[PDB]
């Protein structure tokens with residue numbers, strides 16, 4: 001089976017439930033950065049669409065990505081939930097943030113519609129990491 | 134204004150119409166690779182959700198990304214349209230492809246819901262490129 005380190009704050013999430021159903025072996029830790037660690041280089045940050053939008057409003061998104069990159073050489077951000085129909089911010093603000101993180105900071109931003117899908121992504125990434133290690 | 138080179142096959146698309154409304158100055162060329170060129174390093178490939186799925190079915194997606202990377206150091210792929218509810222392929226096949234391109238090949242995959250949104254992304258990326266040149 002594949003092994004993934006999970007931050008304590010994620011322990012009782014539906015993501016963890018699906019990872020367990022998928023047969024993933026989890027090791028719990030309290031991480032200063034990241035939510036799911038796949039390898040010494042690959043770490044995943046789970047962020048809801050609402051929190052992404054809030055971090056854009058408060059201008060804290062870039063500091064968050066900076067911190068991720070300084071801790072892991074190959075960080076990944078999974079944005080969970082729909083970003084559409086969510087007012088309180090012009091679409092260009094969301095688009096601009098996405099483009100900056102993925103193209104400028106060079107941090108992949110994979111989109112997931114549910115916690116189950118976030119788990120499915122974590123699982124397939126970890127499986128590939130294990131196979132090529 | 135910002136300047137973008139557009140491949141001839143895109144000339145009469147709704148993407149081009151919006152780019153023109155946004156004030157972008159377009160130079161038409163027949164490109165061997167890429168759909169919208171922003172700089173010597175940044176090129177954008179527009180691909181509909183249906184074509185993305187088809188390229189996964191036919192196993193041609195990776196060759197396409199390879200070709201993009203060999204032509205431009207900083208290529209970007211904009212997937213246009215929803216990938217959900219589109220059967221004829223298991224979700225893991227789509228997820229796996231997305232993860233491979235963005236994390237392994239290191240090519241950003243920005244998602245757009247419409248040709249207008251694809252244009253909005255092209256515009257903001259080009260504007261930033263111009264400002265920092």
Ligand SMILES: [Mn+2]
Nearest residue numbers: 035045046047
């Ligand atoms: Mn998180």
Ligand SMILES: [Mn+2]
Nearest residue numbers: 168178179180
């Ligand atoms: Mn295209």
